[PDB]
Design a protein around this ligand. Structure first.
Ligand SMILES: N=C(N)c1ccc2[nH]c(Cc3nc4ccccc4[nH]3)nc2c1
Ligand code: NA
Ligand SMILES: [Zn+2]
Lengths: 252, 11, 36
């Protein structure tokens, strides 16, 4: 996260860390939506241009963290994966359209003051909060500058941007399954997700029922916090029926 | 940079 | 897990559940043309 600040303890109890077994490194961020399912970005697991194709056996999920490199004994929980599900139409060949994946944990995790799931938005919440100008929050243990790793989880609140401005900031083809956020060069405020933050949550707090909803997943950007550019996120509501389907077809 | 995590999570 | 979440989803143990706010959530609610 670039130009973000340290989070507070228990601020994002749904933040998850995808951790590689060997070498032992942070791979991406992810979020906890139930006691058995984690949501992340599919390019964190599969990206053939760089020969990336992780399997169950290659990852570990760490829940309840704050510090990036420490094993927070008695606070965090480490789980193993049972199955990984990538959207069948995830497009890694062109624009990372439908960049979403679900992971089923080997065993249910127990909630605590540091572990609690986030809500997935329903048509109406999506309709009232995903408006240009409204701010969301992104968290992660990713890089602090384009080219610089934090010791604690970082947070930054960014405004959602109008689709035409999103489209006119890049040469990549934008689809309806994505949205962008960030400040205009003009607004004199900065911030962005960056390498290492991928897979994590973009959330908004409903002013109607006070709950936090995960509206997007950190997907891509061109550099980190460059002026005239924005970060793109998977549109979770637009891919929610897929989510429901694998969950009730394979578990809960 | 990562601290070691307990062996039982690798198996 | 599904629509609108889980049941107790989105309500943080250390904040909503104790009626405590974090330092920047105001910024968010204020951009939804002000909350409450
Ligand atoms: N500025 C942004 N909002 C931004 C977000 C996410 C991202 N992701 C990448 C490429 C990228 N994705 C990965 C995944 C796993 C290991 C390395 C890696 N590099 N660039 C960006 C940029
Ligand atoms: Na920018
Ligand atoms: Zn990424």
């Amino acid at each position: 996260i670039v130009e973000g600040s340290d989070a507070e303890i228990g601020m994002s109890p749904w933040q998850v860390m995808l951790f590689r077994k060997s070498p032992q490194e942070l791979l991406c961020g992810a979020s906890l939506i139930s006691d058995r399912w984690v949501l992340t970005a599919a390019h964190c697991l599969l990206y053939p241009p760089w020969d990336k194709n992780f399997t169950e056996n290659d990852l570990l999920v760490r829940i309840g963290k704050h510090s990036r490199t420490r094993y927070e004994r008695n606070i965090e929980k480490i789980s193993m994966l049972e199955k990984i599900y990538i959207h069948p139409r995830y497009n890694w060949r062109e624009n990372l359209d439908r960049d979403i994946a679900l992971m089923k944990l080997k065993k249910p995790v127990a909630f605590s003051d540091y572990i609690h799931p986030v809500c997935l938005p329903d048509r109406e919440t999506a309709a009232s909060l995903l408006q240009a100008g409204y701010k969301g929050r992104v968290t992660g243990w990713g890089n602090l500058k384009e080219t610089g790793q934090p010791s604690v989880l970082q947070v930054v609140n960014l405004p959602i941007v109008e689709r035409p401005v999103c489209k006119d900031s890049t040469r990549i083809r934008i689809t309806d399954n994505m949205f962008c956020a960030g400040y205009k060069p003009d607004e004199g405020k900065r911030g962005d997700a960056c390498e290492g933050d991928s897979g994590g949550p973009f959330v908004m707090k409903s002013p109607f029922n006070n709950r936090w909803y995960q509206m997007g997943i950190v997907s891509w950007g061109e550099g980190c916090d460059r002026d005239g550019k924005y970060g793109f996120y998977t549109h979770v509501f637009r891919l929610k029926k897929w989510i429901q389907k694998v969950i009730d077809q394979f578990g809960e | 940079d990562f601290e070691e995590i307990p062996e039982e999570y690798l198996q | 897990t599904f629509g609108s979440g889980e049941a107790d989803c989105g309500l943080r143990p250390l904040f909503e559940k104790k009626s405590l706010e974090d330092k920047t959530e105001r910024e968010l609610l204020e951009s939804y043309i002000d909350g409450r």
